[PDB]
């Protein structure tokens, strides 16, 4: 059976991720405000055996949605894809749903398996969408921490 855990994520500047309507996630500082707004992910361990990366899929807990990477105008793009809850999650997830989780300096990166060198990213600015970016180590933020909830 596919192994999965429940968790929340925060970017390296402590912005939490929230659902911004049906089609996207946004990142903002929820300190001082109720953290019940943050998305709870169901991170599943999928097939990819890689050396220093762990292939995972990121589902939105109790919402039938998965983070996916699709090409739009020659640019890899992060989308929320609706799925049949009976068929998901699965050990062999489609490549568009797969992210290679990379541990680096006590933080996590999520690189698209479909589009190498593109990562789950947040802006330094408040309340901007979570997106797939192709720069790392600049202004855009590709480092996260997981707050483990349950297995
Ligand atoms: C990639 C990965 C997968 C799974 C886990 C993991 C697995 C289990 C389990 O199988 O039982 C348990 N568990 C607990 C924690 C955990 O305590 N964490 C999450 C991991 N991190 S981190 O993401 O910041 C990190 C990543 C990489 C290297 C170092 C650190 C540390 C934070 C911590 C946590 O959740 N603390 C919350 C405590 N807090 C106290 C107050 O009340 C609210 C809760 N992970 C797992 C781990 C990982 C890996 F990311 F690699 F760590």
Swiss-Prot record:
Phenotype when changing residue 103 to K: Enhanced integrin binding
Coiled-coil residue spans: none
GO cellular component terms listed in the entry, alphabetical order: cytosol; extracellular region; extracellular space; lysosome; secretory granule
Regulation: (Microbial infection) Cleavage by S.pyogenes cysteine protease SpeB promotes its activation independently of CASP1. SpeB-mediated maturation of IL1B plays a dual role depending on infection site: while IL1B inflammatory response prevents bacterial growth during invasive skin infections, it promotes streptococcal infection of the nasopharynx by disrupting colonization resistance mediated by the microbiota.
Molecular function GO terms recorded: cytokine activity; integrin binding; interleukin-1 receptor binding; protein domain specific binding
UniProt-annotated site: Important for interaction with integrin, residues: 53, 61, 63, 72, 86
Modifications made to the protein after synthesis: Activation of the IL1B precursor involves a CASP1-catalyzed proteolytic cleavage. Processing and secretion are temporarily associated. (Microbial infection) Cleavage by S.pyogenes cysteine protease SpeB promotes its activation independently of CASP1.
Protein family (similarity comment): Belongs to the IL-1 family.
General function of this protein: Potent pro-inflammatory cytokine. Initially discovered as the major endogenous pyrogen, induces prostaglandin synthesis, neutrophil influx and activation, T-cell activation and cytokine production, B-cell activation and antibody production, and fibroblast proliferation and collagen production. Promotes Th17 differentiation of T-cells. Synergizes with IL12/interleukin-12 to induce IFNG synthesis from T-helper 1 (Th1) cells. Plays a role in angiogenesis by inducing VEGF production synergistically with TNF and IL6.
Other information: The IL1B production occurs in 2 steps, each being controlled by different stimuli. First, inflammatory signals, such as LPS, stimulate the synthesis and promote the accumulation of cytosolic stores of pro-IL1B (priming). Then additional signals are required for inflammasome assembly, leading to CASP1 activation, pro-IL1B processing and eventually secretion of the active cytokine. IL1B processing and secretion are temporarily associated.
The protein, known as: Interleukin-1 beta
Shown residues within the full chain: 118 to 269 of 269
């Amino acid at each position: 059976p596919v192994r999965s855990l429940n968790c929340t994520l925060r970017d390296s500047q402590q912005k939490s991720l929230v659902m911004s309507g049906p089609y996207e996630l946004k990142a903002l500082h929820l300190q001082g405000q109720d953290m019940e707004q943050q998305v709870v992910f169901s991170m599943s361990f999928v097939q990819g055996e890689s050396n220093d990366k762990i292939p995972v899929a990121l589902g939105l807990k109790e919402k039938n949605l998965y983070l996916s990477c699709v090409l739009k105008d020659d640019k890899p793009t992060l989308q929320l894809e609706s799925v049949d809850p009976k068929n998901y999650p699965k050990k062999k997830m489609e490549k568009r749903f797969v992210f290679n989780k990379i541990e680096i300096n006590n933080k996590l990166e999520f690189e698209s398996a479909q589009f190498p060198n593109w990562y789950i990213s947040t802006s330094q600015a408040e309340n901007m969408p979570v997106f797939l970016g192709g720069t790392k180590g600049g202004q855009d933020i590709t480092d996260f921490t997981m707050q483990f909830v349950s297995s």
